Amino acid sequence: QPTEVSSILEERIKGVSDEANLNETGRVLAVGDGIARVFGLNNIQAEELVEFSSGVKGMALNLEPGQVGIVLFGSDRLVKEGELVKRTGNIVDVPVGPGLLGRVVDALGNPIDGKGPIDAAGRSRAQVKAPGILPRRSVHEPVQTGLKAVDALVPIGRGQRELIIGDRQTGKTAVALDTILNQKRWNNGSDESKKLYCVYVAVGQKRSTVAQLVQTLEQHDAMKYSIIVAATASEAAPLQYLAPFTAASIGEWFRDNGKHALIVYDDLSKQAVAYRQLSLLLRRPPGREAYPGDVFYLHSRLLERAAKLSEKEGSGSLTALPVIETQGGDVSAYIPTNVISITDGQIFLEAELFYKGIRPAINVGLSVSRVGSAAQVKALKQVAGSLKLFLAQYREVAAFAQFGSDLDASTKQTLVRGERLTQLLKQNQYSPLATEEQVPLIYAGVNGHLDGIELSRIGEFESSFLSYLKSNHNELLTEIREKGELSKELLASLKSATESFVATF
Amino acid sequence: AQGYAAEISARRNAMDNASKNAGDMINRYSILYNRTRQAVITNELVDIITGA
Amino acid sequence: TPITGKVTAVIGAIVDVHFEQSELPAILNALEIKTPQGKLVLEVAQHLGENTVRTIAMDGTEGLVRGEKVLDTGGPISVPVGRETLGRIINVIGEPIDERGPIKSKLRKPIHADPPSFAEQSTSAEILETGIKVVDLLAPYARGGKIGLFGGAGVGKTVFIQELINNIAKAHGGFSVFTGVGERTREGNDLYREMKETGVINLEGESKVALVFGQMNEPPGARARVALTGLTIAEYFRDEEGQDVLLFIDNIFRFTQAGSEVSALLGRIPSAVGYQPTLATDMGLLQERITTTKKGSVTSVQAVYVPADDLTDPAPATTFAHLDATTVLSRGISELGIYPAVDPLDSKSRLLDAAVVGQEHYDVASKVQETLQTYKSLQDIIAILGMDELSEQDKLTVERARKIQRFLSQPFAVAEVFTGIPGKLVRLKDTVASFKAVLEGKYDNIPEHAFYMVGGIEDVVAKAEKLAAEAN
Amino acid sequence: STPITGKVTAVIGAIVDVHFEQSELPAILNALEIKTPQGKLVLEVAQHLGENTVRTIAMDGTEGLVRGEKVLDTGGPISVPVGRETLGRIINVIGEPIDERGPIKSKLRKPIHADPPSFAEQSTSAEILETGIKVVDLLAPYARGGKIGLFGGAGVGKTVFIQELINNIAKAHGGFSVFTGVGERTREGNDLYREMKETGVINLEGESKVALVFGQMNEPPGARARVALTGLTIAEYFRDEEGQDVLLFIDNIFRFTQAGSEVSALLGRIPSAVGYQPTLATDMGLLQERITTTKKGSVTSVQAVYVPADDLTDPAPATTFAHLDATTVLSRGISELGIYPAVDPLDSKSRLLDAAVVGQEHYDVASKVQETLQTYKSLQDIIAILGMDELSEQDKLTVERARKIQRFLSQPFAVAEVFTGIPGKLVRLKDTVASFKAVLEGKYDNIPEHAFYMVGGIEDVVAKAEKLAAEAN
Numbered sequence A: 001q002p003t004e005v006s007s008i009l010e011e012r013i014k015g016v017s018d019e020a021n022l023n024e025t026g027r028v029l030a031v032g033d034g035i036a037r038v039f040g041l042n043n044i045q046a047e048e049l050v051e052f053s054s055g056v057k058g059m060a061l062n063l064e065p066g067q068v069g070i071v072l073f074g075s076d077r078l079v080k081e082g083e084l085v086k087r088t089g090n091i092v093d094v095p096v097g098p099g100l101l102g103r104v105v106d107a108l109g110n111p112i113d114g115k116g117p118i119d120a121a122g123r124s125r126a127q128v129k130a131p132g133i134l135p136r137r138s139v140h141e142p143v144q145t146g147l148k149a150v151d152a153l154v155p156i157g158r159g160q161r162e163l164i165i166g167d168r169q170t171g172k173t174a175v176a177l178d179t180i181l182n183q184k185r186w187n188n189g190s191d192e193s194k195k196l197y198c199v200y201v202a203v204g205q206k207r208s209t210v211a212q213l214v215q216t217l218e219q220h221d222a223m224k225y226s227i228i229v230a231a232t233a234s235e236a237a238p239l240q241y242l243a244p245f246t247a248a249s250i251g252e253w254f255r256d257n258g259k260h261a262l263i264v265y266d267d268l269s270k271q272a273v274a275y276r277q278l279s280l281l282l283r284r285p286p287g288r289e290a291y292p293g294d295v296f297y298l299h300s301r302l303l304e305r306a307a308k309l310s311e312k313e314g315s316g317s318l319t320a321l322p323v324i325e326t327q328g329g330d331v332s333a334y335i336p337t338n339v340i341s342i343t344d345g346q347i348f349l350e351a352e353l354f355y356k357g358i359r360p361a362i363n364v365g366l367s368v369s370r371v372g373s374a375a376q377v378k379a380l381k382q383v384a385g386s387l388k389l390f391l392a393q394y395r396e397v398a399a400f401a402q403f404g405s406d407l408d409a410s411t412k413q414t415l416v417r418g419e420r421l422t423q424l425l426k427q428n429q430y431s432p433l434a435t436e437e438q439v440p441l442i443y444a445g446v447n448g449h450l451d452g453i454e455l456s457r458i459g460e461f462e463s464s465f466l467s468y469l470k471s472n473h474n475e476l477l478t479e480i481r482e483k484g485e486l487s488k489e490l491l492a493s494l495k496s497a498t499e500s501f502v503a504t505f
Numbered sequence B: 001a002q003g004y005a006a007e008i009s010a011r012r013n014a015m016d017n018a019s020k021n022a023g024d025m026i027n028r029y030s031i032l033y034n035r036t037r038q039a040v041i042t043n044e045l046v047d048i049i050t051g052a
Numbered sequence C: 001t002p003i004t005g006k007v008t009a010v011i012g013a014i015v016d017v018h019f020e021q022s023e024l025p026a027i028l029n030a031l032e033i034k035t036p037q038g039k040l041v042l043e044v045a046q047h048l049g050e051n052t053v054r055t056i057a058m059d060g061t062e063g064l065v066r067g068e069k070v071l072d073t074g075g076p077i078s079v080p081v082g083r084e085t086l087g088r089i090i091n092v093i094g095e096p097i098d099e100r101g102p103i104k105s106k107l108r109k110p111i112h113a114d115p116p117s118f119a120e121q122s123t124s125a126e127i128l129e130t131g132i133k134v135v136d137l138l139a140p141y142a143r144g145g146k147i148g149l150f151g152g153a154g155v156g157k158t159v160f161i162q163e164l165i166n167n168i169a170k171a172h173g174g175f176s177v178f179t180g181v182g183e184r185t186r187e188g189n190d191l192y193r194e195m196k197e198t199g200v201i202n203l204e205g206e207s208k209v210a211l212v213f214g215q216m217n218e219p220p221g222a223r224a225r226v227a228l229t230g231l232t233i234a235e236y237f238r239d240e241e242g243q244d245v246l247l248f249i250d251n252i253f254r255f256t257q258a259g260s261e262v263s264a265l266l267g268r269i270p271s272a273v274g275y276q277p278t279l280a281t282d283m284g285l286l287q288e289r290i291t292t293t294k295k296g297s298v299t300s301v302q303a304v305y306v307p308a309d310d311l312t313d314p315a316p317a318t319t320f321a322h323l324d325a326t327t328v329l330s331r332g333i334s335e336l337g338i339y340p341a342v343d344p345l346d347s348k349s350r351l352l353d354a355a356v357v358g359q360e361h362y363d364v365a366s367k368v369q370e371t372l373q374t375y376k377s378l379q380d381i382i383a384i385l386g387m388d389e390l391s392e393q394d395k396l397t398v399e400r401a402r403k404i405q406r407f408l409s410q411p412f413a414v415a416e417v418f419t420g421i422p423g424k425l426v427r428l429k430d431t432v433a434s435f436k437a438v439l440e441g442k443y444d445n446i447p448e449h450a451f452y453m454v455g456g457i458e459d460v461v462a463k464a465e466k467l468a469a470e471a472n
Numbered sequence D: 001s002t003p004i005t006g007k008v009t010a011v012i013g014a015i016v017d018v019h020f021e022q023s024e025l026p027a028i029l030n031a032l033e034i035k036t037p038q039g040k041l042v043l044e045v046a047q048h049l050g051e052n053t054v055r056t057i058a059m060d061g062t063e064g065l066v067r068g069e070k071v072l073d074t075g076g077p078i079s080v081p082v083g084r085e086t087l088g089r090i091i092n093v094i095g096e097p098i099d100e101r102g103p104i105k106s107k108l109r110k111p112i113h114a115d116p117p118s119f120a121e122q123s124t125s126a127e128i129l130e131t132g133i134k135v136v137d138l139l140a141p142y143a144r145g146g147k148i149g150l151f152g153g154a155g156v157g158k159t160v161f162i163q164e165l166i167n168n169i170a171k172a173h174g175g176f177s178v179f180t181g182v183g184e185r186t187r188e189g190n191d192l193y194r195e196m197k198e199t200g201v202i203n204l205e206g207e208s209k210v211a212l213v214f215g216q217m218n219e220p221p222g223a224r225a226r227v228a229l230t231g232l233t234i235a236e237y238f239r240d241e242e243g244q245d246v247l248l249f250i251d252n253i254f255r256f257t258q259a260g261s262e263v264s265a266l267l268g269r270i271p272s273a274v275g276y277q278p279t280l281a282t283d284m285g286l287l288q289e290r291i292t293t294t295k296k297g298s299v300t301s302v303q304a305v306y307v308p309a310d311d312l313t314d315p316a317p318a319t320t321f322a323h324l325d326a327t328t329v330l331s332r333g334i335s336e337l338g339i340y341p342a343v344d345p346l347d348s349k350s351r352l353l354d355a356a357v358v359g360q361e362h363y364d365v366a367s368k369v370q371e372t373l374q375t376y377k378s379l380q381d382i383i384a385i386l387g388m389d390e391l392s393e394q395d396k397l398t399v400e401r402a403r404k405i406q407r408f409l410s411q412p413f414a415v416a417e418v419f420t421g422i423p424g425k426l427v428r429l430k431d432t433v434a435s436f437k438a439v440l441e442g443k444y445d446n447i448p449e450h451a452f453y454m455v456g457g458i459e460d461v462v463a464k465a466e467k468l469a470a471e472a473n
């Protein structure tokens, strides 16, 4: 063949050979499936906000020489081929401040609650880099989530990234909401150091589910210090992908201002799926389980923003609570393994314990808290060490409980203590418990005071014990709440109270 | 006494039979587990050479 | 001047059309082609460029030549809406499938509309007394919410849909719309005949249900967009009429299947396990367009066909999170004899609250779940270790769980020819009381087979007496 | 010479495409520095795309990438500071210190990628390393110049074990050490640096002995993939020119191979070798082969392997299982019992655990302790299902001694005082062997098992025995 054909494809389909000044403008060569390809925009930046003629905003992810790949912030109906496009001259941002509290906002910061406009102290970049290595402090202030099991065996501290990984309908968002409700104990006070402002992301979440969540928050008067960043599955994939970063900036506003903020990354798998859709539409090279390339980098950049700032930076803390949904309990997939490797803690809500009624069913055998007792109440740490020891013993002897054969007396006692403690850590939805309340039951359980009480009556024992402590031994609860440490006299008084209560049942 | 001895001898035999059943079930299901986990590798191979 | 285009490429259900003008039709626009056998409608999917766009064929591309004249409507696909559609079969393009003349609808709303905003979300926890023991016990159905019927092939999904229709739509009172998404035409004909016989459909009078069929024989675009058409019907019934809409979407997984269908030929890079990359987003708008607003309510009843009974498949897995009430029809219980097959564990609903169904109902549901979970955990123990080689309490719990699983079976009126027993119905209070009595051990001596294919506890004792009399 | 410069044409996430002029095309694995407003960004070439275009990976945040910006080549890979001045300072993959303490005026500057030592230079290591931990000093002794693997999952204590190793080695040996933080968390990084400052190994106003090559996961995948080889370059520079034994500490080899497969996912890099990365064998061998006991010095590579839910089916943990010679698995179950070091006595094997290398007495003591503990977990099931009284008296003595030894395994860490509050105990290998032999001989069988728990030497054992006797009564 004297003249072989070696050409493949070129993004240029119309030979003009003239016309200029398209550095800031451009024309859409191809648009579809929520993404657009535009020739021009020579001086545009990476994922810089770009304005279309129809009014739909865009993001410049793909920047190939032929054209700039634009993902649309909504439906593609309004945008057509050849439409004029213009640069916004700035990156995407989100309004931030103290006025976000008490309002529900869109991923772009637009108030979707419909109760008026939004008042923000300022505007911050959506894609803000994580705080530097030096301006960080060790996680020592605990986050009182309210549920006994998570507070005791897998505690969460301010600025700690603890992942709530679980199967569908296991209560991950239930655990998050219970933490938000527990935060109202200090959010209604005056000391901003103990105040834990809360923000919630709803990516890939139902709008009806978001409405139910905000209604539940309003019912407990916890919505005032909560910010709902909702990016429903009806909205465009770029909006869902950008919502967690905007909420991270919102939390970083509190973190840099000296306040304490708690961010929960609900349904991070939905964000991963949205980014996968965006990359596959943009013809980016797919990776493992067809997921996009820079997905682990995405998760790291999103999660490392939340931390505990040093004293010179205002001593602020941003607590991350990522939530992912496993497919059949398979934690070996790309997103599960990545998120487990990123976050400090991984709270394991597996459906098997939920079907056993543990509720919220924290798999203490697999749940991990790297911060551990460092960011925990000293009394809570004291009870939780023995609690973790007893649950470990029960787990390594739990098989004989199923067997139910003629076991050793010590092994039978350990099994009874473990099952009583598992029944004890069971809580109800939207029923948080403070440390002043939580510590006495853990101490009673680890001291063997629950052995006499039957397994089916552990809940009644718990309720009557809180009633008795709030009625008679109120000074003990106040001392536990204020001091936070169980002294020898305090321990003796608590053990006497537990003995009297178990005598009275 | 002899009935107790024979009962526990038959208990040992029955639990040995259950142990053999558990062993061969575990062997065949571990072969199945290896097959399935290798099939995950085949699936990731096919979707990487098709997508990319 | 109407917009005119010429067909350039025809690839199965994908048609490429070029317009010789700057006035390019927008996405999702309806493009009609005059075929010798009728009219073929094309829905714009992507703007490929060079004044050419990619379309989805609403009908089979029979005899489609390159350069055939194409006419743009100007808006999305519009179907007839209002009371006229009641008692009439509605196609994906809106043309009356039935041969009872045209539809004199006052308006023709497009099938592509924005979902209701977050402000107009009137969530509620109203109960729905369907009449089936297991769903009324473990995953109570929510009035005005979204309803799931996950199950595999040959597990009773269509049978469950028909039974729910018979139980509720007759006493529903408000309007309803049945939407067949990618299902067998024979089943649709049987359903149409059954609702005609039961009086739900009145050809010569007033009908409470509007029928939209996008049957599994139709091209992929029709299967994908019939869900949108029926959703538009339900939305108009909810908003304009202000009535509780009993939307019965059948095989909603076919929408995602058709999305993957068109995605392969649209140039999209396949997602995990070969699904379409935009599955999450498009199903998100489709499902979020179903919600309870202030104007009214749409009680969508969806059945999801899970491929290979693999609940980790992306489409059913994400439908799990995008839905309030879940009813998993596991095959392992379907072949076990309890063909209702509602797996008593993954079938969960947001109504399972002490303040919604009552403390007694919550306690009963928790205890039955505990017993069935003990049974599942000790399945292998019974299997090869030995049932007799077990503790007394564990054996009693296993027996109670087996009795409960047998009791979960309920004859269906639509499945009377299938199960051979008349389809009696049970009220929620009766089910709660019967299960509470069973959990107390008051019927331990009664054999497990007495709970087979029965309704209330009265049916249980009657069956026990009859088996005692016949066996002696 | 005129600086070699070009124009950016494409930036796809962390991947940036740059166009160069005629005869201006650089080589692969080079440095493409682009002057960015947010500091300084440099790109490393991965493959040539033709038409005078190079496909690169961003070594720093890809914010603000515009096509047409002037990107200047550095003439090779981005040289990182190497020398004694790098000690006590965190250095990233780009050579720009993130400690705001002034630039590292290093003696030289070596590229990240270098030719591995030849086949003749390869040799085996048979020298004992004093790590100051009784259990790993006796049962699984470390090798001076070998490749050590610190297996363990999540919440098992790998990184704290590594930092304790650095502290103990620096206290007991003057050789410098390097810790590469591949896939290192920022909060964990602040904890690591605070511990280094408080332990005296890092002296800001004086001389330090450990240099951090922290990875900072939030940087693009290329930084995570190449921080390991950056720390390896630091280690080989310390070994060759200084001629001293150095301690290479890989933060997480699993994260390194994950980042390699990740950067493969960004580029074409059609995975063929293992399934997720086709290059994985190439760069994996390039990294591991470079840690070698050359004639200049010895580099001991202590890598931490993270197994997610025991994913041994995946080739990635098996690949690390092939490289190392002595394992120090840190199974979580042991830490759940109270022995927070969590190293499994029976699963942490050592290649150099033989009478010819570690010593006849040392090997005999280690083997006897391992056998006693193996009998412990062998009879634990029957003790749990039946009881203690029916067990034979010889097995009773063995299980009691094994319980005492298991309590003895836990040792205070000088780096763990912020969580435990117990001052660390820097034990010696000879002291460890003598104490274990004395305990196993039955001379201290009457001492309660709690005495051996959370202590150092046998003197600490009797001290805690007296303390607990006083506390009890």
Ligand SMILES: Nc1ncnc2c1ncn2[C@@H]1O[C@H](COP(=O)(O)OP(=O)(O)O)[C@@H](O)[C@H]1O
Binding pocket: A167, A168, A169, A170, A171, A172, A173, A174, A175, A325, A359, A360, A427, A428, A429, C320, C321, C348, C349, C350, C352
């Ligand atoms: N303490 C509890 N008691 C009872 N049920 C609970 C508790 N915690 C969670 N749940 C159940 O968990 C479900 C919430 O699951 P969710 O986190 O929404 O899963 P997904 O996010 O995958 O939809 C609720 O339906 C609720 O019934």
Ligand SMILES: Nc1ncnc2c1ncn2[C@@H]1O[C@H](COP(=O)(O)OP(=O)(O)O)[C@@H](O)[C@H]1O
Binding pocket: C151, C152, C153, C154, C155, C156, C157, C158, C159, C160, C305, C339, C340, C410, C411, C412, C415, C418, C419
């Ligand atoms: N209550 C019942 N009694 C007996 N057979 C039943 C019952 N319910 C369903 N079936 C059987 O199950 C089949 C329904 O399968 P189905 O799950 O609808 O398949 P698909 O979901 O693919 O449509 C019917 O053929 C019927 O014979």
Ligand SMILES: Nc1ncnc2c1ncn2[C@@H]1O[C@H](COP(=O)(O)OP(=O)(O)O)[C@@H](O)[C@H]1O
Binding pocket: A369, A370, A371, A372, D153, D154, D155, D156, D157, D158, D159, D160, D161, D188, D340, D341, D413, D416, D419, D420
């Ligand atoms: N020997 C030890 N002494 C005291 N604390 C420890 C010890 N080992 C682990 N920890 C605690 O457990 C946590 C584990 O963190 P890290 O080692 O970084 O993660 P991983 O355990 O997954 O490797 C640390 O925060 C540390 O406080």
Ligand SMILES: [Mg+2]
Binding pocket: A172, A173, A174, A266
């Ligand atoms: Mg949730």
Ligand SMILES: [Mg+2]
Binding pocket: C157, C158, C183, C251, C303, C305
């Ligand atoms: Mg069906």
Ligand SMILES: [Mg+2]
Binding pocket: D158, D159
């Ligand atoms: Mg670590």
